[PDB]
């Protein structure tokens, strides 16, 4: 337990020297598990106009456990919650050594370009995104604005 | 294998929003987690059953490395609770000795077996519904 499992040291360091395009994440000085994140809105979705900060946490039991991650940005969507939890199927029960952190991030990518308010997990945004689709994407674009960091 | 002070809190509302005591947050787009409601239900054989007392909790910058604040919203006649301010006062001691292991849950359920200690037990009680 003197040093960090290998295959954290190789994630991280492929997180580097293969980036996922519109993609940036990397540990604290301080906590190797703890890791910055920021992904640019996908184009053309509601949220195009920002870039998005994240937080994601290696626990002890990586891989067979899932990385832990949130939006600090404050986001309007679907799938993410108030708190900037996620709803992805791959962070929860469907999580298996054989994913990595790469595969988290492009679907969390993914997710802000095609929000789901269909799925049986969504959270209480989604009622209005069934309803009034172009109400509650205006709504996304505009807190994009007002909250995400601007892209240049 | 220290977990982030973002990732506990998180750890703790999980842990929340699934019998003696219940704590959630104040706002519920608190993103940084700071305030937190707490309640816990007063022991039996004491001036405290049945009373179910509201109290308010700051998880600041350095939580939990550093104790959280705690103050009582609902009045209680208890030698640990400042009798102005309703702050739970800084020689409690599960303040005083605080671990980062420590949670909300250790501090309320702690409070709660305060309210039971013989001495604690017998203090006369505010009406019921007074606030500090």
Not at chain 1, 3 to 19: A, F, G, N, Q
Not at chain 1, 89 to 115: F, Y
Request: aromatic share 8%.
């Amino acid at each position: 337990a003197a040093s960090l499992p290998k295959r954290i040291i190789k994630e991280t360091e492929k997180l580097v020297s293969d980036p996922v395009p519109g993609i940036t994440a990397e540990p604290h000085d301080d906590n190797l598990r703890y890791f910055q994140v920021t992904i640019e809105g996908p184009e053309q979705s509601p949220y195009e106009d920002g870039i998005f900060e994240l937080e994601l946490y290696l626990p002890d039991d990586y891989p067979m456990e899932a990385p832990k991650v949130r939006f600090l940005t404050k986001i309007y969507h679907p799938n993410i919650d108030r708190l900037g939890r996620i709803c992805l199927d791959v962070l929860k029960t469907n999580w298996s050594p054989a994913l990595q952190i790469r595969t988290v991030l492009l679907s969390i990518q993914a997710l802000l370009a095609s929000p789901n308010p269909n799925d049986p997990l969504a959270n209480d945004v989604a009622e209005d995104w069934i309803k009034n689709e172009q109400g509650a994407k205006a709504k996304a674009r505009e807190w994009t604005k007002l909250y995400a960091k601007k892209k240049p | 294998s220290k977990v982030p002070r973002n990732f506990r809190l998180l750890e703790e509302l999980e842990k929340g929003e699934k019998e003696s005591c219940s704590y959630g947050l104040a706002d519920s787009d608190d993103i940084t987690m700071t305030k937190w409601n707490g309640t816990i239900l007063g022991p039996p054989h004491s001036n405290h059953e049945n009373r179910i007392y509201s109290l308010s909790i700051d998880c600041g910058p350095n939580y939990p490395d550093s104790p959280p604040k705690v103050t009582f919203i609902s009045k209680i006649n208890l030698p640990c609770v400042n009798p102005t301010t309703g702050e739970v006062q800084t020689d409690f001691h599960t303040l005083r000795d605080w671990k980062r292991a420590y949670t909300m849950e250790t501090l309320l359920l702690d409070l709660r077996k305060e309210m039971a200690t013989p001495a604690n037990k017998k203090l006369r009680q505010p009406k019921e519904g007074e606030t500090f």
